[PDB]
Amino acid sequence: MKTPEDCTGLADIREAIDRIDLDIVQALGRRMDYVKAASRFERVAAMLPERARWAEENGLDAPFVEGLFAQIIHWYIAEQIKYW
Amino acid sequence: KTPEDCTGLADIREAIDRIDLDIVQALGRRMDYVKAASRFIPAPERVAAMLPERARWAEENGLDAPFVEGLFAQIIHWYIAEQIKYW
């Protein structure tokens, strides 16, 4: 995948973003496999600040990114409840 | 460890933190691409093509489409804003 600097035009950039967004979706997909697998077995309060930290380390607005994981974490918690 | 190789919440959570980090790093790379793009903000048409595709990706991966499309609607929307501030 051409690096941001090796992108000659908008075409290169958009295809890179599509690959990244798909990586994210596939990662979310894997995430759900792990969560459901955790069914047979403070956390949330520890997880969010941690993701906010990672966000800052990666040059992203921490609050926005933490808000995204707040949405993700609760969705997976709600999904897991039906797998009790 | 794969989902089936996790012996407890310890392995599960390590795998989940790993995946969440991968996502944050991906969002980071994503921003490097949007910023590099300035040299040339996505048009309403690009956005309209992008969202349905991400919904489709969600389904192929066993995820709820409305939910995932909403997440990406937020990501694109926020990045467009950041793209304007980066100018």
From Swiss-Prot, chain A:
Q: Which reaction does it catalyse?
A: isochorismate = salicylate + pyruvate; chorismate = prephenate
Pathway noted in the entry: Siderophore biosynthesis; salicylate biosynthesis
Tell whether Lyase is among the UniProt keywords. yes
Instruction: Write out the entry's keywords from A to Z.
Output: Isomerase, Lyase
**Induction annotation:** Repressed by iron.
Q: Name one Pfam family in it.
A: CM_2
Which stretches make up the Chorismate mutase domain? 4-84
Question: Which sites bind substrate?
Answer: R14, R31, Q80
- EC numbers, comma separated: 4.2.99.21, 5.4.99.5
What is this protein's pH dependence? Optimum pH is 6.8.
Q: Which GO terms describe its biological process?
A: chorismate metabolic process; pyochelin biosynthetic process; salicylic acid biosynthetic process
Classification via SMART domains: CM_2
Record GO terms (molecular function)? carbon-oxygen lyase activity; chorismate mutase activity; isochorismate pyruvate lyase activity
The impact of changing A37I is: Increases the rate constant for the mutase activity by a factor of 1000, and also increases the lyase catalytic efficiency by a factor of 6
Record comment: activity regulation: Inhibited by endo-oxabicyclic diacid resembling to the conformation of the transition state.
Source domain of life is Bacteria
Q: Which InterPro entries match?
A: Chorismate_II_sf, Chorismate_mutase-related, CM_dom_sf, CM_II_prokaryot, Isochorismate_pyruvate-lyase
The function of this protein is:
Involved in the incorporation of salicylate into the siderophore pyochelin. Catalyzes the elimination of the enolpyruvyl side chain from isochorismate to yield salicylate and pyruvate via a rare pericyclic hydrogen transfer mechanism from C2 to C5. PchB also catalyzes the nonphysiological Claisen rearrangement of chorismate to prephenate in which the pyruvylenol tail is transferred from a C3 ether linkage to a C1-C9 linkage.
Q: How does it assemble?
A: Dimer of dimers.
UniProt protein name: Isochorismate pyruvate lyase
Name the source organism.
Pseudomonas aeruginosa (strain ATCC 15692 / DSM 22644 / CIP 104116 / JCM 14847 / LMG 12228 / 1C / PRS 101 / PAO1)
Gene that this sequence comes from: pchB
